[PDB]
JSON list of C-alpha atoms and ligand atoms in Angstrom, two decimals:
[
{"chain": "A", "resi": 1, "resn": "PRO", "atom": "CA", "xyz": [124.08, 80.70, 129.11]},
{"chain": "A", "resi": 2, "resn": "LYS", "atom": "CA", "xyz": [122.80, 78.62, 132.01]},
{"chain": "A", "resi": 3, "resn": "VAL", "atom": "CA", "xyz": [119.56, 77.64, 130.17]},
{"chain": "A", "resi": 4, "resn": "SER", "atom": "CA", "xyz": [118.70, 76.84, 126.58]},
{"chain": "A", "resi": 5, "resn": "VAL", "atom": "CA", "xyz": [114.91, 77.36, 125.95]},
{"chain": "A", "resi": 6, "resn": "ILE", "atom": "CA", "xyz": [113.87, 75.56, 122.74]},
{"chain": "A", "resi": 7, "resn": "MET", "atom": "CA", "xyz": [110.71, 76.93, 121.17]},
{"chain": "A", "resi": 8, "resn": "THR", "atom": "CA", "xyz": [109.07, 75.40, 118.08]},
{"chain": "A", "resi": 9, "resn": "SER", "atom": "CA", "xyz": [106.89, 77.59, 115.83]},
{"chain": "A", "resi": 10, "resn": "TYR", "atom": "CA", "xyz": [104.63, 76.77, 112.93]},
{"chain": "A", "resi": 11, "resn": "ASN", "atom": "CA", "xyz": [101.81, 78.98, 111.71]},
{"chain": "A", "resi": 12, "resn": "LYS", "atom": "CA", "xyz": [100.31, 80.26, 114.99]},
{"chain": "A", "resi": 13, "resn": "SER", "atom": "CA", "xyz": [100.48, 83.97, 114.25]},
{"chain": "A", "resi": 14, "resn": "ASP", "atom": "CA", "xyz": [97.67, 84.87, 116.71]},
{"chain": "A", "resi": 15, "resn": "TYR", "atom": "CA", "xyz": [99.47, 83.29, 119.64]},
{"chain": "A", "resi": 16, "resn": "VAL", "atom": "CA", "xyz": [103.25, 83.35, 119.11]},
{"chain": "A", "resi": 17, "resn": "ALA", "atom": "CA", "xyz": [103.86, 86.90, 120.42]},
{"chain": "A", "resi": 18, "resn": "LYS", "atom": "CA", "xyz": [102.42, 86.22, 123.91]},
{"chain": "A", "resi": 19, "resn": "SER", "atom": "CA", "xyz": [104.53, 83.04, 124.02]},
{"chain": "A", "resi": 20, "resn": "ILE", "atom": "CA", "xyz": [107.79, 84.70, 123.02]},
{"chain": "A", "resi": 21, "resn": "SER", "atom": "CA", "xyz": [107.11, 87.71, 125.32]},
{"chain": "A", "resi": 22, "resn": "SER", "atom": "CA", "xyz": [106.52, 85.38, 128.28]},
{"chain": "A", "resi": 23, "resn": "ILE", "atom": "CA", "xyz": [110.02, 83.92, 127.83]},
{"chain": "A", "resi": 24, "resn": "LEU", "atom": "CA", "xyz": [111.84, 87.23, 127.17]},
{"chain": "A", "resi": 25, "resn": "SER", "atom": "CA", "xyz": [110.40, 88.79, 130.38]},
{"chain": "A", "resi": 26, "resn": "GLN", "atom": "CA", "xyz": [111.53, 85.92, 132.68]},
{"chain": "A", "resi": 27, "resn": "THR", "atom": "CA", "xyz": [113.02, 87.00, 136.02]},
{"chain": "A", "resi": 28, "resn": "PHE", "atom": "CA", "xyz": [115.95, 84.58, 135.34]},
{"chain": "A", "resi": 29, "resn": "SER", "atom": "CA", "xyz": [117.55, 86.15, 132.31]},
{"chain": "A", "resi": 30, "resn": "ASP", "atom": "CA", "xyz": [120.62, 84.03, 131.59]},
{"chain": "A", "resi": 31, "resn": "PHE", "atom": "CA", "xyz": [119.26, 81.92, 128.74]},
{"chain": "A", "resi": 32, "resn": "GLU", "atom": "CA", "xyz": [119.44, 81.58, 125.00]},
{"chain": "A", "resi": 33, "resn": "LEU", "atom": "CA", "xyz": [116.04, 81.20, 123.21]},
{"chain": "A", "resi": 34, "resn": "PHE", "atom": "CA", "xyz": [115.99, 79.05, 120.08]},
{"chain": "A", "resi": 35, "resn": "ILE", "atom": "CA", "xyz": [113.03, 80.02, 117.91]},
{"chain": "A", "resi": 36, "resn": "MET", "atom": "CA", "xyz": [112.88, 77.05, 115.47]},
{"chain": "A", "resi": 37, "resn": "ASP", "atom": "CA", "xyz": [110.33, 78.08, 112.88]},
{"chain": "A", "resi": 38, "resn": "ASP", "atom": "CA", "xyz": [109.22, 75.48, 110.32]},
{"chain": "A", "resi": 39, "resn": "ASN", "atom": "CA", "xyz": [108.94, 77.81, 107.32]},
{"chain": "A", "resi": 40, "resn": "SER", "atom": "CA", "xyz": [105.72, 79.47, 108.45]},
{"chain": "A", "resi": 41, "resn": "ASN", "atom": "CA", "xyz": [103.41, 81.81, 106.53]},
{"chain": "A", "resi": 42, "resn": "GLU", "atom": "CA", "xyz": [104.12, 85.50, 106.28]},
{"chain": "A", "resi": 43, "resn": "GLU", "atom": "CA", "xyz": [101.65, 86.63, 108.91]},
{"chain": "A", "resi": 44, "resn": "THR", "atom": "CA", "xyz": [103.39, 84.44, 111.48]},
{"chain": "A", "resi": 45, "resn": "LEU", "atom": "CA", "xyz": [106.89, 85.53, 110.39]},
{"chain": "A", "resi": 46, "resn": "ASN", "atom": "CA", "xyz": [105.68, 89.18, 110.63]},
{"chain": "A", "resi": 47, "resn": "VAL", "atom": "CA", "xyz": [104.67, 88.65, 114.29]},
{"chain": "A", "resi": 48, "resn": "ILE", "atom": "CA", "xyz": [107.97, 86.96, 115.16]},
{"chain": "A", "resi": 49, "resn": "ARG", "atom": "CA", "xyz": [110.13, 89.53, 113.37]},
{"chain": "A", "resi": 50, "resn": "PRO", "atom": "CA", "xyz": [110.39, 92.30, 116.00]},
{"chain": "A", "resi": 51, "resn": "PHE", "atom": "CA", "xyz": [111.47, 89.80, 118.66]},
{"chain": "A", "resi": 52, "resn": "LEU", "atom": "CA", "xyz": [114.60, 88.87, 116.63]},
{"chain": "A", "resi": 53, "resn": "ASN", "atom": "CA", "xyz": [116.10, 92.17, 117.83]},
{"chain": "A", "resi": 54, "resn": "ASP", "atom": "CA", "xyz": [116.48, 90.63, 121.32]},
{"chain": "A", "resi": 55, "resn": "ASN", "atom": "CA", "xyz": [120.13, 89.45, 121.48]},
{"chain": "A", "resi": 56, "resn": "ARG", "atom": "CA", "xyz": [119.25, 86.23, 123.31]},
{"chain": "A", "resi": 57, "resn": "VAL", "atom": "CA", "xyz": [117.09, 85.00, 120.39]},
{"chain": "A", "resi": 58, "resn": "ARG", "atom": "CA", "xyz": [118.67, 82.30, 118.12]},
{"chain": "A", "resi": 59, "resn": "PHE", "atom": "CA", "xyz": [116.24, 82.17, 115.12]},
{"chain": "A", "resi": 60, "resn": "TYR", "atom": "CA", "xyz": [116.39, 79.29, 112.64]},
{"chain": "A", "resi": 61, "resn": "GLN", "atom": "CA", "xyz": [113.90, 78.83, 109.79]},
{"chain": "A", "resi": 62, "resn": "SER", "atom": "CA", "xyz": [113.58, 75.61, 107.78]},
{"chain": "A", "resi": 63, "resn": "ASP", "atom": "CA", "xyz": [113.05, 75.42, 104.04]},
{"chain": "A", "resi": 64, "resn": "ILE", "atom": "CA", "xyz": [110.35, 72.73, 104.36]},
{"chain": "A", "resi": 65, "resn": "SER", "atom": "CA", "xyz": [107.40, 72.75, 101.93]},
{"chain": "A", "resi": 66, "resn": "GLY", "atom": "CA", "xyz": [104.61, 70.40, 100.76]},
{"chain": "A", "resi": 67, "resn": "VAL", "atom": "CA", "xyz": [102.72, 67.42, 102.25]},
{"chain": "A", "resi": 68, "resn": "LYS", "atom": "CA", "xyz": [105.49, 64.91, 101.55]},
{"chain": "A", "resi": 69, "resn": "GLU", "atom": "CA", "xyz": [108.12, 66.87, 103.49]},
{"chain": "A", "resi": 70, "resn": "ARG", "atom": "CA", "xyz": [105.63, 67.91, 106.23]},
{"chain": "A", "resi": 71, "resn": "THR", "atom": "CA", "xyz": [104.73, 64.21, 106.88]},
{"chain": "A", "resi": 72, "resn": "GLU", "atom": "CA", "xyz": [108.16, 62.56, 106.40]},
{"chain": "A", "resi": 73, "resn": "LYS", "atom": "CA", "xyz": [109.02, 63.12, 110.05]},
{"chain": "A", "resi": 74, "resn": "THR", "atom": "CA", "xyz": [107.34, 64.54, 113.19]},
{"chain": "A", "resi": 75, "resn": "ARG", "atom": "CA", "xyz": [108.65, 68.02, 112.23]},
{"chain": "A", "resi": 76, "resn": "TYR", "atom": "CA", "xyz": [108.76, 69.63, 115.67]},
{"chain": "A", "resi": 77, "resn": "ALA", "atom": "CA", "xyz": [110.83, 66.69, 116.98]},
{"chain": "A", "resi": 78, "resn": "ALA", "atom": "CA", "xyz": [113.30, 67.18, 114.06]},
{"chain": "A", "resi": 79, "resn": "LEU", "atom": "CA", "xyz": [113.55, 70.91, 114.87]},
{"chain": "A", "resi": 80, "resn": "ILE", "atom": "CA", "xyz": [114.07, 70.24, 118.60]},
{"chain": "A", "resi": 81, "resn": "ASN", "atom": "CA", "xyz": [116.89, 67.78, 117.77]},
{"chain": "A", "resi": 82, "resn": "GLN", "atom": "CA", "xyz": [118.52, 70.43, 115.56]},
{"chain": "A", "resi": 83, "resn": "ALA", "atom": "CA", "xyz": [118.39, 72.96, 118.37]},
{"chain": "A", "resi": 84, "resn": "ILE", "atom": "CA", "xyz": [119.75, 70.45, 120.95]},
{"chain": "A", "resi": 85, "resn": "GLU", "atom": "CA", "xyz": [122.84, 69.94, 118.77]},
{"chain": "A", "resi": 86, "resn": "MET", "atom": "CA", "xyz": [123.50, 73.73, 118.90]},
{"chain": "A", "resi": 87, "resn": "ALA", "atom": "CA", "xyz": [122.57, 74.22, 122.56]},
{"chain": "A", "resi": 88, "resn": "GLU", "atom": "CA", "xyz": [125.06, 75.68, 125.00]},
{"chain": "A", "resi": 89, "resn": "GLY", "atom": "CA", "xyz": [123.03, 75.62, 128.19]},
{"chain": "A", "resi": 90, "resn": "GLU", "atom": "CA", "xyz": [123.61, 73.31, 131.15]},
{"chain": "A", "resi": 91, "resn": "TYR", "atom": "CA", "xyz": [119.80, 73.02, 131.60]},
{"chain": "A", "resi": 92, "resn": "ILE", "atom": "CA", "xyz": [117.42, 72.41, 128.67]},
{"chain": "A", "resi": 93, "resn": "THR", "atom": "CA", "xyz": [113.71, 73.35, 128.59]},
{"chain": "A", "resi": 94, "resn": "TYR", "atom": "CA", "xyz": [111.01, 73.40, 125.93]},
{"chain": "A", "resi": 95, "resn": "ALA", "atom": "CA", "xyz": [108.46, 75.97, 124.83]},
{"chain": "A", "resi": 96, "resn": "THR", "atom": "CA", "xyz": [105.89, 76.32, 122.06]},
{"chain": "A", "resi": 97, "resn": "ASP", "atom": "CA", "xyz": [104.18, 79.05, 120.07]},
{"chain": "A", "resi": 98, "resn": "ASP", "atom": "CA", "xyz": [100.86, 78.75, 122.01]},
{"chain": "A", "resi": 99, "resn": "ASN", "atom": "CA", "xyz": [102.05, 78.11, 125.60]},
{"chain": "A", "resi": 100, "resn": "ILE", "atom": "CA", "xyz": [102.91, 80.81, 128.12]},
{"chain": "A", "resi": 101, "resn": "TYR", "atom": "CA", "xyz": [105.63, 80.65, 130.77]},
{"chain": "A", "resi": 102, "resn": "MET", "atom": "CA", "xyz": [104.74, 82.25, 134.11]},
{"chain": "A", "resi": 103, "resn": "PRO", "atom": "CA", "xyz": [107.31, 84.95, 135.06]},
{"chain": "A", "resi": 104, "resn": "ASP", "atom": "CA", "xyz": [109.33, 83.01, 137.62]},
{"chain": "A", "resi": 105, "resn": "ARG", "atom": "CA", "xyz": [109.33, 79.67, 135.77]},
{"chain": "A", "resi": 106, "resn": "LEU", "atom": "CA", "xyz": [113.03, 79.65, 134.80]},
{"chain": "A", "resi": 107, "resn": "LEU", "atom": "CA", "xyz": [114.17, 81.05, 138.17]},
{"chain": "A", "resi": 108, "resn": "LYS", "atom": "CA", "xyz": [112.26, 78.42, 140.15]},
{"chain": "A", "resi": 109, "resn": "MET", "atom": "CA", "xyz": [113.30, 75.49, 137.88]},
{"chain": "A", "resi": 110, "resn": "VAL", "atom": "CA", "xyz": [116.99, 76.54, 137.78]},
{"chain": "A", "resi": 111, "resn": "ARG", "atom": "CA", "xyz": [117.00, 76.86, 141.60]},
{"chain": "A", "resi": 112, "resn": "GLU", "atom": "CA", "xyz": [115.53, 73.38, 142.05]},
{"chain": "A", "resi": 113, "resn": "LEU", "atom": "CA", "xyz": [118.20, 71.71, 139.86]},
{"chain": "A", "resi": 114, "resn": "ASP", "atom": "CA", "xyz": [120.99, 73.79, 141.41]},
{"chain": "A", "resi": 115, "resn": "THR", "atom": "CA", "xyz": [119.88, 72.86, 144.96]},
{"chain": "A", "resi": 116, "resn": "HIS", "atom": "CA", "xyz": [119.41, 69.12, 144.22]},
{"chain": "A", "resi": 117, "resn": "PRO", "atom": "CA", "xyz": [122.23, 67.54, 142.22]},
{"chain": "A", "resi": 118, "resn": "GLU", "atom": "CA", "xyz": [120.57, 64.12, 142.47]},
{"chain": "A", "resi": 119, "resn": "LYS", "atom": "CA", "xyz": [117.60, 65.27, 140.36]},
{"chain": "A", "resi": 120, "resn": "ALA", "atom": "CA", "xyz": [118.20, 65.30, 136.60]},
{"chain": "A", "resi": 121, "resn": "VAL", "atom": "CA", "xyz": [114.68, 65.94, 135.27]},
{"chain": "A", "resi": 122, "resn": "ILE", "atom": "CA", "xyz": [112.10, 68.22, 136.95]},
{"chain": "A", "resi": 123, "resn": "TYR", "atom": "CA", "xyz": [108.55, 69.12, 136.03]},
{"chain": "A", "resi": 124, "resn": "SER", "atom": "CA", "xyz": [105.96, 71.62, 137.29]},
{"chain": "A", "resi": 125, "resn": "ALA", "atom": "CA", "xyz": [102.18, 71.79, 137.33]},
{"chain": "A", "resi": 126, "resn": "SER", "atom": "CA", "xyz": [100.43, 73.32, 134.29]},
{"chain": "A", "resi": 127, "resn": "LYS", "atom": "CA", "xyz": [97.13, 75.12, 133.84]},
{"chain": "A", "resi": 128, "resn": "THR", "atom": "CA", "xyz": [94.81, 75.38, 130.88]},
{"chain": "A", "resi": 129, "resn": "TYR", "atom": "CA", "xyz": [92.01, 77.92, 130.64]},
{"chain": "A", "resi": 130, "resn": "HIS", "atom": "CA", "xyz": [89.07, 77.15, 128.34]},
{"chain": "A", "resi": 131, "resn": "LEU", "atom": "CA", "xyz": [87.31, 80.21, 127.08]},
{"chain": "A", "resi": 132, "resn": "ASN", "atom": "CA", "xyz": [83.78, 80.64, 125.78]},
{"chain": "A", "resi": 136, "resn": "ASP", "atom": "CA", "xyz": [85.23, 84.22, 129.77]},
{"chain": "A", "resi": 137, "resn": "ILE", "atom": "CA", "xyz": [86.56, 81.08, 131.48]},
{"chain": "A", "resi": 138, "resn": "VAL", "atom": "CA", "xyz": [84.14, 78.13, 131.29]},
{"chain": "A", "resi": 139, "resn": "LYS", "atom": "CA", "xyz": [86.64, 75.66, 132.70]},
{"chain": "A", "resi": 140, "resn": "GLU", "atom": "CA", "xyz": [90.11, 75.42, 134.21]},
{"chain": "A", "resi": 141, "resn": "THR", "atom": "CA", "xyz": [92.20, 72.29, 133.93]},
{"chain": "A", "resi": 142, "resn": "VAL", "atom": "CA", "xyz": [95.34, 71.56, 135.95]},
{"chain": "A", "resi": 143, "resn": "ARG", "atom": "CA", "xyz": [97.92, 68.84, 135.37]},
{"chain": "A", "resi": 144, "resn": "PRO", "atom": "CA", "xyz": [99.47, 68.39, 138.82]},
{"chain": "A", "resi": 145, "resn": "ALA", "atom": "CA", "xyz": [103.05, 67.84, 139.96]},
{"chain": "A", "resi": 146, "resn": "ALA", "atom": "CA", "xyz": [102.67, 65.96, 143.24]},
{"chain": "A", "resi": 147, "resn": "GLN", "atom": "CA", "xyz": [104.91, 62.94, 142.91]},
{"chain": "A", "resi": 148, "resn": "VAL", "atom": "CA", "xyz": [108.15, 61.55, 141.52]},
{"chain": "A", "resi": 149, "resn": "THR", "atom": "CA", "xyz": [107.25, 59.55, 138.40]},
{"chain": "A", "resi": 150, "resn": "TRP", "atom": "CA", "xyz": [108.88, 56.92, 136.25]},
{"chain": "A", "resi": 151, "resn": "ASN", "atom": "CA", "xyz": [105.82, 57.15, 133.93]},
{"chain": "A", "resi": 152, "resn": "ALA", "atom": "CA", "xyz": [105.59, 60.60, 132.46]},
{"chain": "A", "resi": 153, "resn": "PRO", "atom": "CA", "xyz": [104.06, 59.85, 129.05]},
{"chain": "A", "resi": 154, "resn": "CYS", "atom": "CA", "xyz": [100.73, 61.67, 128.61]},
{"chain": "A", "resi": 155, "resn": "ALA", "atom": "CA", "xyz": [100.78, 62.73, 132.31]},
{"chain": "A", "resi": 156, "resn": "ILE", "atom": "CA", "xyz": [103.22, 65.66, 131.84]},
{"chain": "A", "resi": 157, "resn": "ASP", "atom": "CA", "xyz": [103.20, 68.16, 128.99]},
{"chain": "A", "resi": 158, "resn": "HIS", "atom": "CA", "xyz": [105.89, 69.18, 126.54]},
{"chain": "A", "resi": 159, "resn": "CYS", "atom": "CA", "xyz": [106.12, 72.64, 128.11]},
{"chain": "A", "resi": 160, "resn": "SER", "atom": "CA", "xyz": [106.37, 71.67, 131.77]},
{"chain": "A", "resi": 161, "resn": "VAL", "atom": "CA", "xyz": [109.87, 70.27, 132.13]},
{"chain": "A", "resi": 162, "resn": "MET", "atom": "CA", "xyz": [113.54, 71.18, 132.61]},
{"chain": "A", "resi": 163, "resn": "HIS", "atom": "CA", "xyz": [116.46, 68.74, 132.56]},
{"chain": "A", "resi": 164, "resn": "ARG", "atom": "CA", "xyz": [120.23, 68.58, 132.72]},
{"chain": "A", "resi": 165, "resn": "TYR", "atom": "CA", "xyz": [122.02, 68.41, 129.38]},
{"chain": "A", "resi": 166, "resn": "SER", "atom": "CA", "xyz": [123.67, 65.15, 130.55]},
{"chain": "A", "resi": 167, "resn": "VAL", "atom": "CA", "xyz": [120.26, 63.39, 130.29]},
{"chain": "A", "resi": 168, "resn": "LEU", "atom": "CA", "xyz": [120.52, 63.81, 126.45]},
{"chain": "A", "resi": 169, "resn": "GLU", "atom": "CA", "xyz": [123.66, 61.62, 126.21]},
{"chain": "A", "resi": 170, "resn": "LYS", "atom": "CA", "xyz": [122.04, 58.54, 127.79]},
{"chain": "A", "resi": 171, "resn": "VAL", "atom": "CA", "xyz": [119.02, 58.84, 125.52]},
{"chain": "A", "resi": 172, "resn": "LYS", "atom": "CA", "xyz": [121.07, 59.16, 122.34]},
{"chain": "A", "resi": 173, "resn": "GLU", "atom": "CA", "xyz": [123.32, 56.26, 123.32]},
{"chain": "A", "resi": 174, "resn": "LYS", "atom": "CA", "xyz": [120.30, 53.94, 123.65]},
{"chain": "A", "resi": 175, "resn": "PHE", "atom": "CA", "xyz": [118.03, 55.29, 120.95]},
{"chain": "A", "resi": 176, "resn": "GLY", "atom": "CA", "xyz": [120.20, 57.03, 118.31]},
{"chain": "A", "resi": 177, "resn": "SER", "atom": "CA", "xyz": [118.52, 60.44, 118.62]},
{"chain": "A", "resi": 178, "resn": "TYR", "atom": "CA", "xyz": [117.01, 62.66, 121.34]},
{"chain": "A", "resi": 179, "resn": "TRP", "atom": "CA", "xyz": [113.35, 63.29, 120.33]},
{"chain": "A", "resi": 180, "resn": "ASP", "atom": "CA", "xyz": [111.80, 60.59, 118.09]},
{"chain": "A", "resi": 181, "resn": "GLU", "atom": "CA", "xyz": [111.40, 61.86, 114.54]},
{"chain": "A", "resi": 182, "resn": "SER", "atom": "CA", "xyz": [109.14, 58.97, 113.52]},
{"chain": "A", "resi": 183, "resn": "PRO", "atom": "CA", "xyz": [105.89, 60.35, 112.10]},
{"chain": "A", "resi": 184, "resn": "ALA", "atom": "CA", "xyz": [103.94, 57.65, 114.00]},
{"chain": "A", "resi": 185, "resn": "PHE", "atom": "CA", "xyz": [104.61, 59.78, 117.12]},
{"chain": "A", "resi": 186, "resn": "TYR", "atom": "CA", "xyz": [103.35, 63.07, 115.73]},
{"chain": "A", "resi": 187, "resn": "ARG", "atom": "CA", "xyz": [100.34, 63.43, 118.08]},
{"chain": "A", "resi": 188, "resn": "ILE", "atom": "CA", "xyz": [102.29, 62.62, 121.26]},
{"chain": "A", "resi": 189, "resn": "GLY", "atom": "CA", "xyz": [105.96, 63.38, 120.44]},
{"chain": "A", "resi": 190, "resn": "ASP", "atom": "CA", "xyz": [106.42, 64.88, 123.90]},
{"chain": "A", "resi": 191, "resn": "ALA", "atom": "CA", "xyz": [105.22, 61.64, 125.49]},
{"chain": "A", "resi": 192, "resn": "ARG", "atom": "CA", "xyz": [107.61, 59.62, 123.25]},
{"chain": "A", "resi": 193, "resn": "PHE", "atom": "CA", "xyz": [110.63, 61.72, 124.25]},
{"chain": "A", "resi": 194, "resn": "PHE", "atom": "CA", "xyz": [109.61, 61.44, 127.97]},
{"chain": "A", "resi": 195, "resn": "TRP", "atom": "CA", "xyz": [109.23, 57.64, 127.43]},
{"chain": "A", "resi": 196, "resn": "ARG", "atom": "CA", "xyz": [112.87, 57.55, 126.22]},
{"chain": "A", "resi": 197, "resn": "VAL", "atom": "CA", "xyz": [114.00, 59.64, 129.20]},
{"chain": "A", "resi": 198, "resn": "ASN", "atom": "CA", "xyz": [112.07, 57.35, 131.62]},
{"chain": "A", "resi": 199, "resn": "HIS", "atom": "CA", "xyz": [114.28, 54.39, 130.54]},
{"chain": "A", "resi": 200, "resn": "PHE", "atom": "CA", "xyz": [116.93, 56.12, 132.71]},
{"chain": "A", "resi": 201, "resn": "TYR", "atom": "CA", "xyz": [115.50, 58.87, 134.92]},
{"chain": "A", "resi": 202, "resn": "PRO", "atom": "CA", "xyz": [112.34, 59.67, 136.94]},
{"chain": "A", "resi": 203, "resn": "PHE", "atom": "CA", "xyz": [110.75, 63.13, 136.75]},
{"chain": "A", "resi": 204, "resn": "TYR", "atom": "CA", "xyz": [110.84, 65.11, 140.03]},
{"chain": "A", "resi": 205, "resn": "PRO", "atom": "CA", "xyz": [107.98, 67.50, 140.89]},
{"chain": "A", "resi": 206, "resn": "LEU", "atom": "CA", "xyz": [107.94, 71.24, 141.55]},
{"chain": "A", "resi": 207, "resn": "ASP", "atom": "CA", "xyz": [104.39, 71.77, 142.84]},
{"chain": "A", "resi": 208, "resn": "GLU", "atom": "CA", "xyz": [103.64, 75.14, 141.32]},
{"chain": "A", "resi": 209, "resn": "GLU", "atom": "CA", "xyz": [101.72, 76.09, 138.14]},
{"chain": "A", "resi": 210, "resn": "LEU", "atom": "CA", "xyz": [104.51, 77.53, 135.96]},
{"chain": "A", "resi": 211, "resn": "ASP", "atom": "CA", "xyz": [103.11, 77.28, 132.42]},
{"chain": "A", "resi": 212, "resn": "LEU", "atom": "CA", "xyz": [99.67, 78.16, 131.00]},
{"chain": "A", "resi": 213, "resn": "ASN", "atom": "CA", "xyz": [97.63, 77.34, 127.93]},
{"chain": "A", "resi": 214, "resn": "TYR", "atom": "CA", "xyz": [94.43, 78.93, 126.57]},
{"chain": "A", "resi": 215, "resn": "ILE", "atom": "CA", "xyz": [91.97, 77.06, 124.39]},
{"chain": "A", "resi": 216, "resn": "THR", "atom": "CA", "xyz": [89.09, 78.82, 122.64]},
{"chain": "A", "resi": 231, "resn": "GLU", "atom": "CA", "xyz": [95.84, 66.68, 103.28]},
{"chain": "A", "resi": 232, "resn": "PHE", "atom": "CA", "xyz": [98.30, 66.73, 106.16]},
{"chain": "A", "resi": 233, "resn": "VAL", "atom": "CA", "xyz": [96.49, 64.30, 108.48]},
{"chain": "A", "resi": 234, "resn": "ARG", "atom": "CA", "xyz": [95.73, 61.89, 105.65]},
{"chain": "A", "resi": 235, "resn": "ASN", "atom": "CA", "xyz": [99.45, 61.43, 104.91]},
{"chain": "A", "resi": 236, "resn": "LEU", "atom": "CA", "xyz": [100.64, 60.58, 108.38]},
{"chain": "A", "resi": 237, "resn": "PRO", "atom": "CA", "xyz": [100.83, 56.90, 109.38]},
{"chain": "A", "resi": 238, "resn": "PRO", "atom": "CA", "xyz": [98.63, 55.38, 112.09]},
{"chain": "A", "resi": 239, "resn": "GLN", "atom": "CA", "xyz": [99.44, 57.20, 115.33]},
{"chain": "A", "resi": 240, "resn": "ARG", "atom": "CA", "xyz": [100.95, 55.34, 118.30]},
{"chain": "A", "resi": 241, "resn": "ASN", "atom": "CA", "xyz": [99.08, 56.10, 121.53]},
{"chain": "A", "resi": 242, "resn": "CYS", "atom": "CA", "xyz": [99.49, 56.84, 125.23]},
{"chain": "A", "resi": 243, "resn": "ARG", "atom": "CA", "xyz": [98.42, 53.42, 126.43]},
{"chain": "A", "resi": 244, "resn": "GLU", "atom": "CA", "xyz": [101.20, 51.77, 124.41]},
{"chain": "A", "resi": 245, "resn": "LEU", "atom": "CA", "xyz": [103.82, 53.96, 126.02]},
{"chain": "A", "resi": 246, "resn": "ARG", "atom": "CA", "xyz": [102.50, 53.73, 129.59]},
{"chain": "A", "resi": 247, "resn": "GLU", "atom": "CA", "xyz": [102.20, 49.93, 129.43]},
{"chain": "A", "resi": 248, "resn": "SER", "atom": "CA", "xyz": [105.75, 49.50, 128.02]},
{"chain": "A", "resi": 249, "resn": "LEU", "atom": "CA", "xyz": [107.09, 51.56, 130.95]},
{"chain": "A", "resi": 250, "resn": "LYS", "atom": "CA", "xyz": [105.05, 49.59, 133.51]},
{"chain": "A", "resi": 251, "resn": "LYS", "atom": "CA", "xyz": [106.58, 46.38, 131.99]},
{"chain": "A", "resi": 252, "resn": "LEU", "atom": "CA", "xyz": [110.05, 47.87, 131.98]},
{"chain": "A", "resi": 253, "resn": "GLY", "atom": "CA", "xyz": [109.71, 48.19, 135.75]},
{"chain": "A", "resi": 254, "resn": "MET", "atom": "CA", "xyz": [112.06, 51.00, 136.71]},
{"chain": "A", "resi": 255, "resn": "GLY", "atom": "CA", "xyz": [109.93, 52.24, 139.65]},
{"chain": "B", "resi": 1, "resn": "MG", "atom": "MG1", "xyz": [127.25, 77.26, 132.46]},
{"chain": "B", "resi": 2, "resn": "MG", "atom": "MG1", "xyz": [100.32, 67.52, 123.31]}
]
């Protein structure tokens, strides 16, 4: 396949079907979709089940259970790294069980990396609708090239060449950071790794959407956005 879409799922039965459907109806169809489920409850597995009949779906379910195992690592980062090791796409992109891709997202992102060989990482704008009908719309823009993506660009708004992954693992030992101190902002921590080597190039269109309408006590103190943004300003790549 040209694209590997990596989706993480854990217990969001009321949202996961719209997410999976938004990927399977993309106008660019040459992808494989990893559905990495972290041993979710039955209601969520029942929602996912019919979509496993789509031949592009690569479904993997962990055997994780209990607060020790759930807090040993940032679990979605461990599941993304597992899917990366199995990925066959030239371009890698990420999805979640409560985020929706707009229909032309893959086509537009694939075209921008095919047209510009000098760009290795691209990102689009993203929109969030708050409901209570809509009471508020939030947009994270994509207006400039940035060497400081942490907390500015979401998990679900990027696409990058597979070759980016090699530089990150050579420096850091893994792709995503499985430390549980980066559970709240694991996306920002992976983008911080990538920004040691590559800037993120903008595609100024809103291509992904979100709607908003004993575990926590066993994680360690969470590292925050300011930490990551200041370390990249000091690093001075841009
Ligand atoms: Mg190929
Ligand atoms: Mg987040």
